[PDB]
Amino acid sequence: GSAVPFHGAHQAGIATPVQDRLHFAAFDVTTEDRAAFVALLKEWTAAARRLTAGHAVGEGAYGGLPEAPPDDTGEALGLKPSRLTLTIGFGPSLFTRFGLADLRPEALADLPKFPGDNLDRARSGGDLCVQACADDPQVAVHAIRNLARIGFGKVVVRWSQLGFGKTSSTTPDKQTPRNLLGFKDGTRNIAGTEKDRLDRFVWAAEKDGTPWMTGGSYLVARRIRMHIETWDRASLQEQEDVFGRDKGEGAPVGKAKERDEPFLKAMKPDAHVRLAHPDSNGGATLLRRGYSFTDGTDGLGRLDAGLFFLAYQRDIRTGFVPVQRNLATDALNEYIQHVGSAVFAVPPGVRDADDWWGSTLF
Amino acid sequence: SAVPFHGAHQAGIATPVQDRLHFAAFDVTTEDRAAFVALLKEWTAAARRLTAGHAVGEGAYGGLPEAPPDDTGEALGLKPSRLTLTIGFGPSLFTRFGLADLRPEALADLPKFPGDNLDRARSGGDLCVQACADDPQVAVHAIRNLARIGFGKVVVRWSQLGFGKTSSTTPDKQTPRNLLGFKDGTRNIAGTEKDRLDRFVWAAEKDGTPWMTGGSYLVARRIRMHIETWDRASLQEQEDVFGRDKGEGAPVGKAKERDEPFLKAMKPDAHVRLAHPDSNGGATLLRRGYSFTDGTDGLGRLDAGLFFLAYQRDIRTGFVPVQRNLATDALNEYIQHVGSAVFAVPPGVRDADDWWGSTLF
């Protein structure tokens, strides 16, 4: 229930241990006033300092002027910080505004069209995003709600996604969670303690070409539907063949333990792990940080289930793009469909109480 | 960490309120009474495994390679999490299997209420399964697997996820707050109040339907909150709407959340005043609802609210009179009922040889 420090060279919510719940929102900007937008970022940063410490925004949730609406909407009163992190990102479409065209990072690449894509344009893109992660879903919603409230008239929510449970791990010492296909998901990821691997694969560096992004990262979000009727009638051997690990232990095929190293030549040529492994992609490595979702029924008598896939990397051109290109023959494709997509540049951390979100860009 | 599955009553009504909910309504696709009873027995066997934290059938792995696993496996490694599974039968079930004359009179159709805007696709249903647990993945795995076992005899009509408190971080005796920011549940029937449960919640044999003795009647309402409108209202307006202050949750004029309210000090159309038993001839409900947030609609607004669940001994003397009295609720400006269903919840599974619905079938 403890707090995650908000200040740092990097934003929390990336290398941070993966919290239980996600409320992810993408925002479109509705003002053309750069000064008004900078004021918003500063106001949002101040609110984030309160929210991530478990305090109410502004002057609080009650005890103010009776005839005024309260500063904070109040539904998190008496709750712990619950490991809340708030991570902000800037979308490519943002750089068409406030004269930022020449500051768009080269590493903020538009994604190509991939085979099988069925992207809903309404639930894709966005000028900016806020990823709210916490162990208490009420804490995460409260944070999104109050940020949106503070930004009224300057930003509007384009789309949002709740994740009811994590399907990722940045802490290999703790149990690996399972996704809705029933397999452990997160075994060979980057751990928050592997400082050298994060510098190598996750954090943007000064020499990479965009100085304001130094210490930031790049985020790919993909909303992925799972064909669970199709999956649930597949045999056990089929399911394990698709991945190359067994279902129970999550060990690489042939081996005894989850964390034994995969021997790829023992997996089928189209097994997901074989195709996604860094060794199959010239070393490309990702920090996966996704969550499961379910949005009611599909109107056809079945549950609607999916995975909200999130990957952080140092350069989208060298991370998600080559790996996803290599998944064109993935056996898993028979069971999933990508239906939403967005990329963001995640700026560096808020250094101290005088700093603010996006200060190095603006 | 686990709640007993067997008893005189089904668990999940008077037992401690868990952190998370997955509620699903199903429609029956078979005309065959024997096939439906077979499914009820199969479901009961699965619920016994699920509520003890085991996989269904022969497990999630380790069986024949060329067969699909009995359990879909996404709860492997998780704890029971206080999972309860509560089944209910909807009025439309009783048009099948020759059951028309066994529908309890207490399972009344709800009237139309002023301001209803019910989405037909998220209303009704032949039966429901209420899955409550502290871990949402344990709840979802339960519904997922019951639906899979029933495939070909039932389909899922609609599904609702909900949350309450997070118990690992919130004290047990602290009242949770709903998404309007007010404490919710102060004056409610508690599972410890055995006499009030007998009076207001459990069906009795003398009530007129013998197969329902020990059961209860459930009303579900999906209630959207107009969040953005509410958040623009003054603090005084919000407290005037309920009749309690926002910080402490105390009735107006009193000091502590649990002071008994003085109704005359509240505005005439304040929510607590209109809902109180003294304003409804003694009518008293067991509220066991959950907050929901499903996303944002097409206009950018928060799709969020209260998934209202009330248990009562007779729908005609519980939910109906109180909801009727809310016709002029000041709260109506800020909410809208958009889904509805009622269910008869049968008595409990008495022992290892009993099964869901045995008293009816």
Ligand code: HEM
């Ligand atoms: C619903 C969609 C997906 C599911 C169910 C899924 C599932 C899994 C599973 C079970 C594993 C093995 C355990 C682990 O090491 O995490 C895995 C590994 C991995 N997946 Fe996926 N995955 C999905 C989508 C993706 C996508 C879209 C990408 C990249 C574009 C990706 C990249 C990877 C990588 C890089 C690994 C680690 C491989 C290694 O280095 O051993 N996954 N995934």
Ligand code: HEM
């Ligand atoms: C979004 C919809 C609703 C919200 C936000 C809401 C909220 C509240 C709040 C804050 C209280 C005061 C604290 C408490 O005693 O729990 C309360 C009391 C109560 N509410 Fe509601 N309520 C809603 C809908 C309903 C409905 C639909 C009914 C019945 C049909 C109902 C019946 C009651 C009752 C019986 C009480 C207890 C009154 C007493 O005995 O003091 N509520 N509600």
